[PDB]
């Protein structure tokens, strides 16, 4: 099952030829995107990240300094104003360094972990575009960690642990790791590349991760660990990535005062855990075949009446569920109850609550699921507490 | 005092010449921006809005169809790929209509209220840029409501109610209101403009809102109610706006099946309540002189020790307040208590919890505020519950406080 077909059926998003590779998130798909942002934020809270927002575009001059112009030119969208040329950012790193560069820094500030849900644009050839997997405008759950050489091992280990921690929520059984080494066009010395590739290879082995080399596929600024997930057709897609950069901070004049009073350039680790939100949503859509776990489901509960005799009770329950923080809708249409149930089932709404006269008298609800399971009559507070528990725990099934 | 000065003082954001009019949001300014998004979302929910995201760019051909190319050329950034020209969006409306246009719509689907925190770029001349108030890249708390002619009154009224509801949280109740009428360069017939302008005036009148006309200041596609807020120099900034558009939906082939199975074109109401997030933060910054309400404050509480002896205790408390959902920092430095209070007052931190030996003993904290007020010792759990309530109610004013700092009484 193809995320593009499911995305249309569940009204998640669309794309059009007036904007190739550019996603229009509809309400329900955007709800998924936002829930993923909430999840990421909760994880970055524990791991102590800042969260920032950089500018959408910056002077071409700045992208010339980083090496992006010489090593990344063809991917970049450019625009002009008042005789100055700007690049729409294809990466968030240079903006993060700009923010790091505001205010004197010392060893006391390191490791400084700086995250952003960063909108990137990369001008992918149109013949290479595919659904949500390969687009031109996407958002990374990005971060750059500024640290000392002595902190590299712990900080890279932290990124690796974050990947497996977050991925375990979604239950991925196939996670293939690649180590992508020096590409033909690059910055930094061969010596720097030797150290950076060895640091990543050793980090993988210390974490007991079998990996394969992907020769020549590293970033222009540094080698990359890539966490690869697989779509329905078993095509490989880079999702999480951890990269070691001994070059950009220097090109952008980043420095701090060390514990020993020597002013030094910080090491920068680049990482994304999900990768791009769009691609990760494509993956989840296929992985679950549109049956999103309850915490991610655009609409968690639909409550239906049999006739308008139960309209008032249905409205009351809907407000009660909604105030409990559940994404709930009332379906009060003059349609047969079996017509309503089938519609919400096909929409993959996890839970459907049916209210007939028996339910109104008892203060209960008849509960069924999108898999056709019939949970019978349940008391309203019990369904609320069960749902709240499954949402709060981000449970994989139930 | 200017929001740009306070912005530096509180490390909210900065700007550089490498990106004129593009904001770099630091952690603490982004915290305020994010909390405003949460607040607006709470209202989108209550008022029954979808929330969507349109793409940054779309073909110039589409922008030509709207009348934006003729009427809005100067302000648009363009870029190209594979011999096709794209406009970076200056508004979110055309993207919303593209979403509406997916799948057959019926009168049953109306009113359809579609919100977006919509990132816009407008190529403002560099000479007229001004801090956060006038930038090139900004985010509107935007929405378009697609409705029938019979629904206009209720839907415009709903937007007006939403403006006063949201502004009341900040203590803005006496709002200056203008009705901006047809500009010299416009689309749509005189008849359509007469109607749209009357509809907005009747809505204001029905709501007992005094207003003035502002001739020729309407959007190219429709007239605008404008809600003005003032900065420290009493300069008038457009914040909230509610607009009536009988032109764009037809230009972009929007339709729905009416009750007699006839094809109809939806009316579109545009509105932003805060305006742009950047401009609204600038306004709040100046209005409160950086004394943001606790729910918005980048750092809500600072816990400080006197000597090394209380460091262990402060850390326990910081962890405890942090698990309770409060934005809290520890200040463990070898500095005098008064030195710390002055710093965190300049940082506008609502509450400062002072921990000496006697506090370690009794499991309590000595509470001070950024307004110089000594609130005595309180129990940790008492402080937590009171902060939680101040945050959840989005209270304008602090514990035991009559009047928050605000420039306009
Ligand atoms: C053209 C195109 N289309 C997509 N759909 C894409 C989807 C995802 C990615 C992608 C996502 C995360 C990371 C990277 S990366 O280039 O390997 N790395 C970076 O960008 C780093 N600067 C970042 C992790 O700090 C790339 C890149 C894409 N590029
Ligand atoms: C150039 C520039 N710089 C800013 N800082 C700006 C800050 C805010 C605004 C602004 C905010 C809200 C609304 C409008 S508007 O042009 O009047 N109206 C619209 O854009 C409508 N399409 C929308 C409300 O649906 C404009 C426009 C700005 N333009
Ligand atoms: Zn990066
Ligand atoms: Zn609009």
From Swiss-Prot, chain A:
Main location: cytoplasm
Positions of Zn(2+) binding: 93, 144, 270
Variant or mutagenesis effect after changing residue 238 to A: Wild-type Thr activation and aminoacylation
EC number: 6.1.1.3
Effect seen on changing residue 55 to S: Confers resistance to borrelidin (BN); KM for L-Thr is unchanged, KM for ATP increases to 187 uM, KI for BN increases to 4.5 nM
Subunit structure: Homodimer; binds 2 tRNA(Thr) per homodimer, each tRNA contacts both monomers and makes specific contacts with the anticodon and acceptor stems.
Entry's family note: Belongs to the class-II aminoacyl-tRNA synthetase family.
Protein name: Threonine--tRNA ligase
Annotated organism of origin: Escherichia coli (strain K12)
């Amino acid at each position: 099952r193809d995320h593009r077909k499911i995305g249309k059926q569940l009204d998640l998003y669309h794309m059009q030829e007036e904007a190739p590779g550019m996603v229009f998130w509809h309400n329900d798909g955007w709800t998924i995107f936002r829930e993923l942002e909430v999840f990421v934020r909760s994880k970055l809270k524990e791991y102590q990240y800042q969260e920032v927002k950089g500018p959408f575009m910056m002077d071409r001059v700045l992208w010339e300094k980083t090496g992006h112009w010489d090593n990344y030119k063809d991917a970049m969208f450019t625009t002009s104003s008042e005789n100055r040329e700007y690049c729409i950012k294809p990466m968030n790193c240079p903006g993060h360094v700009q923010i790091f560069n505001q205010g004197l820094k010392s060893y006391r500030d390191l490791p400084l972990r700086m995250a952003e849900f960063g909108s990137c644009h990369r001008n992918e050839p149109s013949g290479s575009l595919h659904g949500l997997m390969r687009v031109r405008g996407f958002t990374q759950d990005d971060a750059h960690i500024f640290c000392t050489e002595e902190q590299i091992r712990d900080e890279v280990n932290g990124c690796i642990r974050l990947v497996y921690d977050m991925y375990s929520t979604f239950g991925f059984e196939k996670i293939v790791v690649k180590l992508s080494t020096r590409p033909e066009k690059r910055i930094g010395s061969d010596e720097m590349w030797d150290r950076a590739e060895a640091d990543l290879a050793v980090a993988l082995e210390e974490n007991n991760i079998p990996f394969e080399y992907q020769l020549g596929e590293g970033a222009f600024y540094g080698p990359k660990i890539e966490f690869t997930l697989y779509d329905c057709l078993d095509r490989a897609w880079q999702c999480g990535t951890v990269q070691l950069d001994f070059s950009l901070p220097s090109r952008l004049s980043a420095s701090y005062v060390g514990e020993d009073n020597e002013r030094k350039v910080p090491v920068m680790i680049h990482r994304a855990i999900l990768g791009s939100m769009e691609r990760f949503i494509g993956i989840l859509t296929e992985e679950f075949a549109g049956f999103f776990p309850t915490w991610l489901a655009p609409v968690q509960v639909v409550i239906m009446n049999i006739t308008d005799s139960q309209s008032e009770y249905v409205n009351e329950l809907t407000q009660k569920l909604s105030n409990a923080g559940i994404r709930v809708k009332a379906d009060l249409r003059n349609e047969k109850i079996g017509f309503k149930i089938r519609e919400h089932t096909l929409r993959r709404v996890p839970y459907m609550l049916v209210c007939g006269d028996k339910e109104v008298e008892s203060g209960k609800v008849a509960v069924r699921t999108r898999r056709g399971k019939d949970l019978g009559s349940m008391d309203v507070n019990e369904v609320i507490e069960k749902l709240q528990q499954e949402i709060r725990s981000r449970s994989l099934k139930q």
